[PDB]
Design a protein around this nucleic acid. Structure first.
Ligand SMILES: [Mg+2]
Ligand SMILES: [Mg+2]
Ligand SMILES: [Mg+2]
Ligand SMILES: [Mg+2]
Ligand SMILES: [Mg+2]
Ligand SMILES: [Mg+2]
Ligand SMILES: [Mg+2]
Ligand SMILES: [Mg+2]
Ligand SMILES: [Mg+2]
Ligand SMILES: [Mg+2]
Ligand SMILES: [Mg+2]
Ligand SMILES: [Mg+2]
Ligand SMILES: [Mg+2]
Ligand SMILES: [Mg+2]
Ligand SMILES: [Mg+2]
Ligand SMILES: [Mg+2]
Ligand SMILES: [Mg+2]
Ligand SMILES: [Mg+2]
Ligand SMILES: [Mg+2]
Ligand SMILES: [Mg+2]
Ligand SMILES: [Mg+2]
Ligand SMILES: [Mg+2]
Ligand SMILES: [Mg+2]
Ligand SMILES: [Mg+2]
Ligand SMILES: [Mg+2]
Ligand SMILES: [Mg+2]
Ligand SMILES: [Mg+2]
Ligand SMILES: [Mg+2]
Ligand SMILES: [Mg+2]
Ligand SMILES: [Mg+2]
Ligand SMILES: [Mg+2]
Ligand SMILES: [Mg+2]
Ligand SMILES: [Mg+2]
Ligand SMILES: [Mg+2]
Ligand SMILES: [Mg+2]
Ligand SMILES: [Mg+2]
Ligand SMILES: [Mg+2]
Ligand SMILES: [Mg+2]
Ligand SMILES: [Mg+2]
Ligand SMILES: [Mg+2]
Ligand SMILES: [Mg+2]
Ligand SMILES: [Mg+2]
Ligand SMILES: [Mg+2]
Ligand SMILES: [Mg+2]
Ligand SMILES: [Mg+2]
Ligand SMILES: [Mg+2]
Ligand SMILES: [Mg+2]
Ligand SMILES: [Mg+2]
Ligand SMILES: [Mg+2]
Ligand SMILES: [Mg+2]
Ligand SMILES: [Mg+2]
Ligand SMILES: [Mg+2]
Ligand SMILES: [Mg+2]
Ligand SMILES: [Mg+2]
Ligand SMILES: [Mg+2]
Ligand SMILES: [Mg+2]
Ligand SMILES: [Mg+2]
Ligand SMILES: [Mg+2]
Ligand SMILES: [Mg+2]
Ligand SMILES: [Mg+2]
Ligand SMILES: [Mg+2]
Ligand SMILES: [Mg+2]
Ligand SMILES: [Mg+2]
Ligand SMILES: [Mg+2]
Ligand SMILES: [Mg+2]
Ligand SMILES: [Mg+2]
Ligand SMILES: [Mg+2]
Ligand SMILES: [Mg+2]
Ligand SMILES: [Mg+2]
Ligand SMILES: [Mg+2]
Ligand SMILES: [Mg+2]
Ligand SMILES: [Mg+2]
Ligand SMILES: [Mg+2]
Ligand SMILES: [Mg+2]
Ligand SMILES: [Mg+2]
Length: 127
RNA sequence: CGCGGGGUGGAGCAGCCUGGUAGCUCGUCGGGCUCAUAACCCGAAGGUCGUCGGUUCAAAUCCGGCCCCCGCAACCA
RNA sequence: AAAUGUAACA
RNA sequence: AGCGCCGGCCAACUCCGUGCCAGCAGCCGCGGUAAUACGGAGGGCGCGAGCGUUACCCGGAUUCACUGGGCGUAAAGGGC
RNA sequence: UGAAACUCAAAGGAAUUGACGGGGGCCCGCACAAGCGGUGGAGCAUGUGGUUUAAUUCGAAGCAACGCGAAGAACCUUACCAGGCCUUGACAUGCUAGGGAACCCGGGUGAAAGCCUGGGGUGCCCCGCGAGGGGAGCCCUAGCACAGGUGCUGCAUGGC
RNA sequence: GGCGACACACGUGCUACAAUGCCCACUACAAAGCGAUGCCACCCGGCAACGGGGAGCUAAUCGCAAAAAGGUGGGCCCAGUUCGGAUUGGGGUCUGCAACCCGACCCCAUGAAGCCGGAAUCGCUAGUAAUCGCGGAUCAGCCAUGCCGCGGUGAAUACG
RNA sequence: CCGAGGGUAGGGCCCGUGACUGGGGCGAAGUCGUAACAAGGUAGCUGUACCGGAAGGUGCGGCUGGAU
């Protein structure tokens, strides 16, 4: 009866991908973006998933502008689709000189895996 | 369909022709300089040589077949 | 001869 | 007997809820876990069969200056 | 010659105090230079970042964090983790009601804690040759107030 | 049980890479401190850690205590060595209720890296640096190569 | 005859609208470089001309509202 939470979402079993992005703020949020990939990596290890990093791009001041991880595991999309959203991080900021309290956002978008095959065969019934 | 040129680390190229030895640049990784990043400095890692087969003692290299890439040609009615 | 430092100063 | 208001201008202050959200806002600005500025309450101030809002006119605006302004550097001397 | 839509709550002049300048002048400090010995390489000790972990408690973050809080982590310390337990409780001030107070000595179970339990005599001022009747010395049991928290905020603070 | 983890990364230190050195034996010269379930003379057993005896000292009295470099002699002969002392095997001691994780010390055996360190970087202007040992706080014991002190020997250089 | 108006033709002005295109204003965050403010690291500004991803550069002349 607890698989009315996860058995309701078409494909809540495909090896999903996590698409994390920096955002408002910049350096601070790129720091927070790298913090948030670490957060989901340690998450996925403590849950039997495979921590499979497909594409990075590190930020130029300090941190990550964007990342994509393959959460290669079982039922992975069910758990991480309820992680889709923009994660605000209100926090206290280290890149601002006089130590001011700042807000910086970064997102986490989550999708499953499809066939990704666009090789439709030409059949003489319709030519 | 024809002719002839290519495929070699993450990227772009060199290496073949006169076989044994795969190099350069950028990147990547560890260290330094800086308050910090870039730049720079020191050290390091990195290639089934498109595949099948095989020339030879030995193939990235030589010779066939296939597979993608590039150029040219495809005329006279 | 040598670049840059965003976004919340009581 | 109701309506507006109680951060400054501008008269009237506390408690709770909230926690850059929900919202306020005429200007300056309020709200990121002790908010007299948001929402409710208690209390208070101002009017009263009215109280506020929007629109428009004059005023404040000597901010088109007749009364009554300016032009080196603030906007402003025409190139002669 | 010369607009408007739209937009902002300013754009501005001069002067002041700072701060800064790959501006200047004059000075100082093992700042450089002059030297001598090191670190960075090795093995080890130690702290830290990470990573790992059930936990590898927590803080310190350029100089001015990193043999720093730690001038002594095997248990204790210990604030973390796992497991076994306790509920006015390891500790304060209470008020109320039952036991006997008070203190020492063993038995069972158990890793220990804890749970269970068998021992034994309470002064006082007192009716006491008498059963018996306390008060409050301190403990035990049941309550209700309360305790307790190295849980957060050093960006609410004092102190250092 | 963990704070002691370990593909890695940085800071602080210890010991070194040797001949101005290492080892053995003998022999000198300090200061500041600490010490009554404490400091332990001296004796004996053990190669030893240590153990068993046992005097003294509320300590300018007695004890820790030997200071070490140094000095005098002997060995080593330039080698990864009589340098270096990591790592590991085995056997023991002591503290402690208890040394698996996770103690210090002794003995036999083993005897690693390291041939003076890239970019870079630290300290010190005189009894200083360098080097040598001694004490204490904490403390059952100790992971102290740390810290706070103490004295011994004792430089180089500063144009600017 | 004139004449409301209707019709034919041609102009003028104004408004709405149009594939596409030019630049402009706003922005809590992006990319590239760092032109100006200190002599801003090539003094700055300027009219003009040519040029360049971009701020901008250079020529000619001018101003000081230019440090030493
Ligand atoms: Mg022809
Ligand atoms: Mg009102
Ligand atoms: Mg206020
Ligand atoms: Mg008023
Ligand atoms: Mg008032
Ligand atoms: Mg809300
Ligand atoms: Mg309101
Ligand atoms: Mg607050
Ligand atoms: Mg509140
Ligand atoms: Mg209160
Ligand atoms: Mg108001
Ligand atoms: Mg209110
Ligand atoms: Mg009336
Ligand atoms: Mg009205
Ligand atoms: Mg008006
Ligand atoms: Mg008027
Ligand atoms: Mg006038
Ligand atoms: Mg005027
Ligand atoms: Mg002007
Ligand atoms: Mg002007
Ligand atoms: Mg004139
Ligand atoms: Mg003109
Ligand atoms: Mg001025
Ligand atoms: Mg001034
Ligand atoms: Mg200066
Ligand atoms: Mg210095
Ligand atoms: Mg020097
Ligand atoms: Mg040197
Ligand atoms: Mg070194
Ligand atoms: Mg080292
Ligand atoms: Mg790392
Ligand atoms: Mg911490
Ligand atoms: Mg810590
Ligand atoms: Mg420090
Ligand atoms: Mg310690
Ligand atoms: Mg132990
Ligand atoms: Mg413990
Ligand atoms: Mg405990
Ligand atoms: Mg403070
Ligand atoms: Mg803090
Ligand atoms: Mg304070
Ligand atoms: Mg422990
Ligand atoms: Mg620790
Ligand atoms: Mg360990
Ligand atoms: Mg290192
Ligand atoms: Mg070190
Ligand atoms: Mg050390
Ligand atoms: Mg040393
Ligand atoms: Mg050897
Ligand atoms: Mg040896
Ligand atoms: Mg070697
Ligand atoms: Mg040698
Ligand atoms: Mg050296
Ligand atoms: Mg040396
Ligand atoms: Mg250097
Ligand atoms: Mg000095
Ligand atoms: Mg020495
Ligand atoms: Mg010592
Ligand atoms: Mg002592
Ligand atoms: Mg001790
Ligand atoms: Mg140890
Ligand atoms: Mg007619
Ligand atoms: Mg007519
Ligand atoms: Mg007509
Ligand atoms: Mg008609
Ligand atoms: Mg447009
Ligand atoms: Mg310029
Ligand atoms: Mg500039
Ligand atoms: Mg300039
Ligand atoms: Mg020009
Ligand atoms: Mg152009
Ligand atoms: Mg270009
Ligand atoms: Mg040019
Ligand atoms: Mg000129
Ligand atoms: Mg002129």
């Amino acid at each position: 009866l607890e698989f009315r939470r996860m058995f309701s979402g078409e494909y809540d079993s495909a090896d999903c991908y996590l698409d994390i992005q920096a955002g408002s703020g910049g350096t601070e949020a790129q720091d927070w973006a790298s913090m948030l990939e670490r957060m989901y990596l340690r998450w996925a290890e403590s849950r039997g998933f495979k921590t499979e990093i497909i594409e990075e791009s590190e930020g130029e001041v300090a941190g990550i502008k964007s990342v994509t991880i393959k959460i290669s595991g079982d039922y992975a999309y069910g758990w991480l689709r309820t992680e889709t959203g923009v994660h605000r991080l209100v926090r206290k900021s280290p890149f601002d000189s006089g130590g001011r309290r700042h807000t910086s956002f970064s997102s986490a978008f989550v999708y499953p895996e499809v066939d990704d095959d666009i090789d439709i065969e030409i059949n003489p019934a319709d030519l």
